[PDB]
Amino acid sequence: NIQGITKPAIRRLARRGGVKRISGLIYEETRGVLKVFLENVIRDAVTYTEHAKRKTVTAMDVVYALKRQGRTLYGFGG
Amino acid sequence: RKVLRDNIQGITKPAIRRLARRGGVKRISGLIYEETRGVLKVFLENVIRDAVTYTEHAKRKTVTAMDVVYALKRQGRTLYGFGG
Amino acid sequence: RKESYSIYVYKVLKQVHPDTGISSKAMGIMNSFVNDIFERIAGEASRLAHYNKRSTITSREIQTAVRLLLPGELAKHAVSEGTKAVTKYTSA
Amino acid sequence: KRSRKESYSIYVYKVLKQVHPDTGISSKAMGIMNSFVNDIFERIAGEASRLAHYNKRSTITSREIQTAVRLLLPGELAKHAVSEGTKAVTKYTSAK
Amino acid sequence: KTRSSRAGLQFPVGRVHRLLRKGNYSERVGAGAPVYLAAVLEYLTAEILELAGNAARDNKKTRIIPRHLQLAIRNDEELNKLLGRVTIAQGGVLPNIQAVLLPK
Amino acid sequence: RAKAKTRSSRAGLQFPVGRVHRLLRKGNYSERVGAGAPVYLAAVLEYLTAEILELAGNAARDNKKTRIIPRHLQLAIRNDEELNKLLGRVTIAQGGVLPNIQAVLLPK
Amino acid sequence: PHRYRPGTVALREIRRYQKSTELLIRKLPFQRLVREIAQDFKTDLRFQSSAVMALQEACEAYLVGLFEDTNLCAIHAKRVTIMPKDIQLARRIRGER
Amino acid sequence: KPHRYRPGTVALREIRRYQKSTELLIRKLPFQRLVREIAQDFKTDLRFQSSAVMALQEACEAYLVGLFEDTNLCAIHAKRVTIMPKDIQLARRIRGERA
DNA sequence: ATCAATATCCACCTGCAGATTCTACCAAAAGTGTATTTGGAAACTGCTCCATCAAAAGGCATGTTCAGCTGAATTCAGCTGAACATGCCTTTTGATGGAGCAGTTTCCAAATACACTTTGGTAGAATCTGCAGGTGGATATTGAT
DNA sequence: ATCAATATCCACCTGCAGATTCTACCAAAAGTGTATTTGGAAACTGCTCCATCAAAAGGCATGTTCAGCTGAATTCAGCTGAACATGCCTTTTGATGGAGCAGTTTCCAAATACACTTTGGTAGAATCTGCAGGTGGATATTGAT
């Protein structure tokens, strides 16, 4: 499914980032990184869910999890 | 006592040179030295501001090892070997 | 229930800009911001109480915690508003 | 007229004997080990406290400590640490 | 009258006090603390709502949306340092193109 | 009362389950502290201390010294992916760095 | 016929996306990726729509920041083209690797 | 002959040699002085437990050595062997210290 | 395809500073018996949350074409590493004077802990700000005297 | 630099839809008024631990030469990555429901906090004994013919 993050979606992210010319390898590389990121966050999100004896990962879990990772997020759980 | 002025020049060219060695640096530009001192200064300032804030809050006039530690911890530079 | 600082964020909005309004998502962001800061300041004040072996958190701790977390000018002005509101509260 | 100063020196020295009985440990390095034990303690207990909090319980149990260890400790260290944890908990509970 | 009014604020000194006892920050909470704190929170909310409201003005909208809060925060050295490790959801980035990339 | 053995021994550890429990009540981590908590925690702390003292003792052995000094703890921690990730933002005072020279810098 | 010289639609796009705030990754593909990754950790998991939202937001913000740091690296090496060499430097320095 | 090592070699000799030790690389007094001066401009008439000065020196050297590592990586990335201010600035821009 | 020139080890030595272990308070667990909460354990609701179903519509996938950007190859001025001499200034050793912690007790100024007795959270409902086009406006861009 | 030919955003207005914002009700808090404990302020005084000095030594820092080689600057061209029109499909999105599932209440059995009243772990002292400087030669490792 990580192939679903398409070439032009990564391309756009790169634009908004200030990137003018994008190597061909980047795309694959990017996905690599994106995956690690998600994994990490989701491991933590899910750990929170498990500890709450719930089967639904909630917005707040994701938030707490992202906060642990040093990536605080404003707009959801708080 | 005595006036303290231009002490950051006491961090010498070879001391900065050594730090650069232990860091994996083989060839060192000439400008580096000045630049380095710039950075070093900001660093210390930040840490000491916080160290001192802790001292003040404790109504003490002695900055202690533990203050420096707490202060460094705030800065995200935890340190092992002193206050704990 | 589900508490919130929406009411007060909206009050302060009226004060500074009475001509202006605020979307659901941005009020969300403001709650996040108020809770974030709250935890930072209270945490730091708690560590402060702790290092000094007192069991109580006073306006003093809150203050030096603000000194520690807030950058320069924001810190000055915030300490300002703080001690001001403390005295105006104390003078009943 | 004494002024105390606790420490984990005793126990770090015990565990040293266990693993390497041939080996000793300098003042500075015992210092580093106390810093390390206190650092970790604060991380695990902090995280367990946040945990108790999000879930509106007022008590921290071996359960919180556990999932806190899962959150702070990287992979293998986490596995082995949970291992020793629950082991010592049961051996304690069986009044063992 | 609310402790909030006795101190001349909008933020609930009533609530912040509870939030501090119930938070496990320490055993007891002096009665000045919730006030000094609600004071600082109110100030910060003010400063940023101010800057964001201006950002809304310049964008020709009467209502504040995240993009405005992001503009407000990144365009302000001190606020930005403060929330330097925080991401506003729906905020985008500040238009900025490195010089070297602009046509000859 | 009968003869009281430490909670530390009743759980089969060296770390003071007695102390850790206090340190948890007195630390304002929460209102009450279950009695399994200080044990699970003193257990994890003891494990970590073991793992690292182990790897450091080996570093001492290879350096031909019988006694552990900080340089050894640093070698032990940085040379160990998982311990290093764990204390990745921590600096051991008196530790030095791991000998490491980027390839490109070595004579032709 | 007409046809902009290579590099110009680039800058057009930079200027244009920096200016907006819409999520740049099609939503469904992402939701999918998320459920798959979650799967490999705990099974039979449900997701509040907003949890998925939070993840997508955090990710895009992450990656954009990354690309900024990468660009800085590309430029530092006297180039205009970001390469994997670059991302790897950026993360090596950040602390992530 | 006379004898004289070709430029770059005493470099590597020194790298290999300092990476191998742990002694503080900044003469101690100069540093103590710098510290007292910087502290001065924040609060006046301040005393310093010798160990507070020690903690600072340790944290600083550790800091700077780490910096130089990251810098070197930058120099190399730009196809050079010489670290320049351009480099330190990149390293910190990325770390977050000056974004 | 060497060996002078040294620095780098590496093993052997040996006295001292630093550890390891001993000897005795006292600060602090631990054992016991009680007084509550707190954390579950079932049994039931409103809810989100996952499933389709079924199209259109963008958005993504493709193969062509080629403009320009990265890499390489060479110059070469010149910056910085290297070696030596020169004496500065940091290190070390103690030696105090005393500012300032920190112990220890008395004593207020304050916050907990009730027992009860309006704010702020929810959930509808009437405007209304922005969304979304739709053009025509210099605008920027790129080909061509 | 100008002339001219496409697309390019880009304001001015103009109509609605999904949201604000405004109001009506109310439990769930916030507020009060006491009545105490008890945390932490003050004022002694013990006494570490700091700033400061003398002082003598020799390790390093410092300044100048000398040219080795690195960085920076040009010039060149292979191919890679942008650009675009042509085709195809996978995302929206939009309700429509079914249920798997978080959220609540009411009991209790579980489990911790308390409330004063036997060593374990901390603080000097007491001996030991790794290991920091000293060397002297075995091994390099470098760099000149």
mmCIF file of N, CA, C and O (backbone and C1' of nucleotides) in Angstrom, chain B residues 1 9 12-15 17-18 26-27 59 62, chain J residues 41-42 50-53 60-62 68 70-71:
data_model
loop_
_atom_site.group_PDB
_atom_site.id
_atom_site.type_symbol
_atom_site.label_atom_id
_atom_site.label_comp_id
_atom_site.label_asym_id
_atom_site.label_seq_id
_atom_site.Cartn_x
_atom_site.Cartn_y
_atom_site.Cartn_z
ATOM 1 N N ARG B 1 36.168 43.210 42.424
ATOM 2 C CA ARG B 1 37.458 42.532 42.409
ATOM 3 C C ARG B 1 38.328 43.039 41.274
ATOM 4 O O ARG B 1 39.196 43.897 41.476
ATOM 5 N N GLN B 9 38.409 34.818 24.367
ATOM 6 C CA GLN B 9 39.608 34.672 23.562
ATOM 7 C C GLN B 9 40.576 33.684 24.213
ATOM 8 O O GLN B 9 41.577 33.285 23.603
ATOM 9 N N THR B 12 41.563 29.030 23.159
ATOM 10 C CA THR B 12 42.639 29.298 22.213
ATOM 11 C C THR B 12 42.459 28.619 20.878
ATOM 12 O O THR B 12 41.512 27.896 20.680
ATOM 13 N N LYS B 13 43.365 28.866 19.947
ATOM 14 C CA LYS B 13 43.258 28.250 18.634
ATOM 15 C C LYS B 13 43.548 26.752 18.713
ATOM 16 O O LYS B 13 42.862 25.956 18.080
ATOM 17 N N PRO B 14 44.570 26.353 19.494
ATOM 18 C CA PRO B 14 44.804 24.919 19.593
ATOM 19 C C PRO B 14 43.771 24.165 20.441
ATOM 20 O O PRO B 14 43.603 23.003 20.203
ATOM 21 N N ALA B 15 43.098 24.783 21.396
ATOM 22 C CA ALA B 15 42.094 24.074 22.159
ATOM 23 C C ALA B 15 40.901 23.819 21.271
ATOM 24 O O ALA B 15 40.292 22.749 21.297
ATOM 25 N N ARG B 17 41.208 23.607 18.169
ATOM 26 C CA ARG B 17 41.767 22.641 17.206
ATOM 27 C C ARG B 17 41.627 21.193 17.699
ATOM 28 O O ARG B 17 41.122 20.355 16.981
ATOM 29 N N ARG B 18 42.057 20.921 18.930
ATOM 30 C CA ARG B 18 41.854 19.642 19.592
ATOM 31 C C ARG B 18 40.398 19.197 19.586
ATOM 32 O O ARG B 18 40.076 18.109 19.123
ATOM 33 N N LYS B 26 39.869 16.752 10.024
ATOM 34 C CA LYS B 26 41.232 16.678 9.508
ATOM 35 C C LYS B 26 41.788 18.042 9.068
ATOM 36 O O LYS B 26 42.892 18.443 9.462
ATOM 37 N N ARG B 27 41.028 18.758 8.248
ATOM 38 C CA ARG B 27 41.453 20.090 7.825
ATOM 39 C C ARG B 27 40.496 21.194 8.300
ATOM 40 O O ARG B 27 39.299 21.181 8.010
ATOM 41 N N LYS B 59 17.004 31.136 46.434
ATOM 42 C CA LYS B 59 17.532 32.173 47.317
ATOM 43 C C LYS B 59 18.963 31.867 47.753
ATOM 44 O O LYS B 59 19.332 32.131 48.892
ATOM 45 N N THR B 62 25.155 30.790 45.495
ATOM 46 C CA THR B 62 26.080 29.805 44.912
ATOM 47 C C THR B 62 25.406 28.926 43.878
ATOM 48 O O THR B 62 24.551 28.125 44.211
ATOM 49 P P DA J 41 8.893 30.065 52.708
ATOM 50 O "O5'" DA J 41 8.979 31.293 53.726
ATOM 51 C "C5'" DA J 41 7.829 31.812 54.387
ATOM 52 C "C4'" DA J 41 8.280 32.676 55.555
ATOM 53 C "C3'" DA J 41 9.658 33.302 55.346
ATOM 54 O "O3'" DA J 41 9.735 34.653 55.810
ATOM 55 C "C1'" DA J 41 9.691 31.859 57.255
ATOM 56 P P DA J 42 11.167 35.333 56.060
ATOM 57 O "O5'" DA J 42 11.566 34.828 57.523
ATOM 58 C "C5'" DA J 42 10.584 34.932 58.541
ATOM 59 C "C4'" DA J 42 11.204 35.060 59.918
ATOM 60 C "C3'" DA J 42 12.515 35.839 59.990
ATOM 61 O "O3'" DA J 42 12.633 36.453 61.265
ATOM 62 C "C1'" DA J 42 12.891 33.615 60.600
ATOM 63 P P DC J 50 33.082 24.734 46.991
ATOM 64 O "O5'" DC J 50 33.242 26.280 46.622
ATOM 65 C "C5'" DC J 50 32.230 27.247 46.949
ATOM 66 C "C4'" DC J 50 32.814 28.654 46.984
ATOM 67 C "C3'" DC J 50 33.817 28.974 45.881
ATOM 68 O "O3'" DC J 50 33.443 30.170 45.223
ATOM 69 C "C1'" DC J 50 34.806 29.334 48.067
ATOM 70 P P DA J 51 34.374 30.794 44.068
ATOM 71 O "O5'" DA J 51 35.220 31.912 44.827
ATOM 72 C "C5'" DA J 51 34.592 33.126 45.232
ATOM 73 C "C4'" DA J 51 35.606 34.073 45.830
ATOM 74 C "C3'" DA J 51 36.642 34.541 44.829
ATOM 75 O "O3'" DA J 51 37.155 35.792 45.248
ATOM 76 C "C1'" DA J 51 37.697 33.284 46.469
ATOM 77 P P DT J 52 37.866 36.771 44.193
ATOM 78 O "O5'" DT J 52 39.328 36.955 44.790
ATOM 79 C "C5'" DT J 52 39.427 37.188 46.172
ATOM 80 C "C4'" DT J 52 40.781 36.697 46.599
ATOM 81 C "C3'" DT J 52 41.813 36.850 45.495
ATOM 82 O "O3'" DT J 52 42.595 38.007 45.775
ATOM 83 C "C1'" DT J 52 42.065 34.829 46.770
ATOM 84 P P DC J 53 43.715 38.500 44.737
ATOM 85 O "O5'" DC J 53 45.085 38.053 45.435
ATOM 86 C "C5'" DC J 53 45.236 38.211 46.843
ATOM 87 C "C4'" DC J 53 46.301 37.271 47.385
ATOM 88 C "C3'" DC J 53 47.550 37.136 46.524
ATOM 89 O "O3'" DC J 53 48.498 38.134 46.909
ATOM 90 C "C1'" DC J 53 46.842 34.999 47.436
ATOM 91 P P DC J 60 50.805 20.128 28.041
ATOM 92 O "O5'" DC J 60 50.518 21.330 27.038
ATOM 93 C "C5'" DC J 60 51.360 22.469 27.099
ATOM 94 C "C4'" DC J 60 50.595 23.747 26.867
ATOM 95 C "C3'" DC J 60 49.891 23.786 25.519
ATOM 96 O "O3'" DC J 60 48.813 24.733 25.601
ATOM 97 C "C1'" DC J 60 51.973 24.986 25.457
ATOM 98 P P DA J 61 47.850 25.007 24.338
ATOM 99 O "O5'" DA J 61 47.800 26.594 24.252
ATOM 100 C "C5'" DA J 61 48.268 27.454 25.298
ATOM 101 C "C4'" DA J 61 48.926 28.663 24.650
ATOM 102 C "C3'" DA J 61 48.341 29.189 23.317
ATOM 103 O "O3'" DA J 61 48.060 30.610 23.467
ATOM 104 C "C1'" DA J 61 50.687 28.787 23.118
ATOM 105 P P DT J 62 47.456 31.483 22.254
ATOM 106 O "O5'" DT J 62 48.624 32.539 21.946
ATOM 107 C "C5'" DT J 62 50.001 32.325 22.287
ATOM 108 C "C4'" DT J 62 50.954 33.092 21.385
ATOM 109 C "C3'" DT J 62 50.466 33.432 19.977
ATOM 110 O "O3'" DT J 62 51.173 34.597 19.491
ATOM 111 C "C1'" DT J 62 52.307 32.019 19.802
ATOM 112 P P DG J 68 56.730 21.238 -1.717
ATOM 113 O "O5'" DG J 68 55.652 20.162 -1.211
ATOM 114 C "C5'" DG J 68 55.399 19.934 0.184
ATOM 115 C "C4'" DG J 68 53.914 19.717 0.443
ATOM 116 C "C3'" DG J 68 53.165 18.952 -0.644
ATOM 117 O "O3'" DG J 68 52.236 18.041 -0.019
ATOM 118 C "C1'" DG J 68 52.210 21.145 -0.409
ATOM 119 P P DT J 70 45.186 17.320 -0.121
ATOM 120 O "O5'" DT J 70 43.832 18.094 0.237
ATOM 121 C "C5'" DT J 70 43.816 19.217 1.125
ATOM 122 C "C4'" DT J 70 43.207 20.436 0.462
ATOM 123 C "C3'" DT J 70 41.846 20.234 -0.207
ATOM 124 O "O3'" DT J 70 40.840 20.971 0.540
ATOM 125 C "C1'" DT J 70 43.345 21.594 -1.493
ATOM 126 P P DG J 71 39.278 20.920 0.116
ATOM 127 O "O5'" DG J 71 38.838 22.462 0.112
ATOM 128 C "C5'" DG J 71 39.752 23.545 0.275
ATOM 129 C "C4'" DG J 71 39.378 24.697 -0.648
ATOM 130 C "C3'" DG J 71 37.922 24.750 -1.115
ATOM 131 O "O3'" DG J 71 37.492 26.119 -0.994
ATOM 132 C "C1'" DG J 71 39.401 24.506 -3.006
#
